[PDB]
DNA sequence: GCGTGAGCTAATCTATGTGAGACTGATGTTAACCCTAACCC
């Protein structure tokens, strides 16, 4: 929600001693998402994807940027719990940048060796919740 | 007829450990083939 999301939470995965500040990241991601209750012109639908999912400073890419971070692979799991249930808003017909987010979720599936009921079974509800609300563009999913 | 919130107990769920089944390769053992102390015709 707040534009300062990059400044506040991209700093977290830059410093050493990743043991700790995972709860700080959890507080940041709860604050950015408590604002999701508003429904009058959010104007952040196209903003989040370029910020939380982009290959440059996204958060789903913070699995390829989390592989070496074993201490930040279960903490990453715990923050991405809420980061992946963030999609829980079935009141929009918008489908921007869903094509690449599909394979991003596929990568999230084929990345984590553990938390198999915590990172998976938490992803791939984009399928059957977000996707298959489709067959209007349907370029690559099937 | 039916929503909606609280507490609970059932159901996980991964980390770690242990054993059963399949497998693989180094090894030593038995064995085919031949040579050798020694004598003595």
Swiss-Prot record:
Residues with the N6-acetyllysine modification: 111
Post-translational modification: Autophosphorylated at two clusters, the T2609 cluster and the S2056 cluster. Autophosphorylation induces a conformational change that leads to remodeling of the DNA-PK complex, requisite for efficient end processing and DNA repair. S-nitrosylated by GAPDH.
Cysteines paired by S-S bonds: none
Compartments reported by the entry: Nucleus; Nucleus, Nucleolus; Cytoplasm, Cytosol
Role this protein plays: Serine/threonine-protein kinase that acts as a molecular sensor for DNA damage. Involved in DNA non-homologous end joining (NHEJ) required for double-strand break (DSB) repair and V(D)J recombination. Must be bound to DNA to express its catalytic properties. Promotes processing of hairpin DNA structures in V(D)J recombination by activation of the hairpin endonuclease artemis (DCLRE1C). Recruited by XRCC5 and XRCC6 to DNA ends and is required to (1) protect and align broken ends of DNA, thereby preventing their degradation, (2) and sequester the DSB for repair by NHEJ.
Reported disease: Immunodeficiency 26 with or without neurologic abnormalities: A form of severe combined immunodeficiency characterized by reduced or absent T and B cells, recurrent candidiasis, and lower respiratory tract infections. Some patients show dysmorphic features, severe growth failure, microcephaly, seizures, and impaired neurological functions.
Subunit structure: DNA-PK is a heterotrimer of PRKDC and the Ku dimer (composed of XRCC6/Ku70 and XRCC5/Ku86). Formation of this complex may be promoted by interaction with ILF3. Component of the core long-range non-homologous end joining (NHEJ) complex (also named DNA-PK complex) composed of PRKDC, LIG4, XRCC4, XRCC6/Ku70, XRCC5/Ku86 and NHEJ1/XLF. Additional component of the NHEJ complex includes PAXX. Following autophosphorylation, PRKDC dissociates from DNA. Interacts with DNA-PKcs-interacting protein (KIP) with the region upstream the kinase domain.
Family: Belongs to the PI3/PI4-kinase family.
Protein name in UniProt: DNA-dependent protein kinase catalytic subunit
Phylogenetic classification of the source organism: Eukaryota, Metazoa, Chordata, Craniata, Vertebrata
Chain's gene name: PRKDC
Parent-record interval covered: 7 to 148 of 4128
């Amino acid at each position: 929600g707040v534009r300062c999301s990059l400044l506040r939470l991209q700093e977290t995965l830059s410093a050493a001693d990743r043991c700790g500040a995972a709860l700080a990241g959890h507080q940041l991601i709860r604050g950015l998402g408590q604002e999701c209750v508003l429904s009058s012109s959010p104007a952040v639908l196209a903003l989040q994807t370029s910020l939380v999912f982009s290959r440059d400073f996204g958060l789903l890419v913070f699995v390829r940027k989390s592989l070496n971070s074993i201490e930040f692979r279960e903490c990453r799991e715990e923050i991405l719990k809420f980061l992946c249930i963030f999609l829980e808003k079935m009141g929009q017909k918008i489908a921007p940048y869903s094509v690449e987010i599909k394979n991003t979720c596929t990568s999230v599936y084929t990345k984590d060796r553990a938390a198999k009921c915590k990172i998976p079974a938490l992803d791939l509800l984009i399928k059957l919740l977000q996707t298959f609300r489709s067959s209007r563009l349907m370029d690559e999913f099937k």
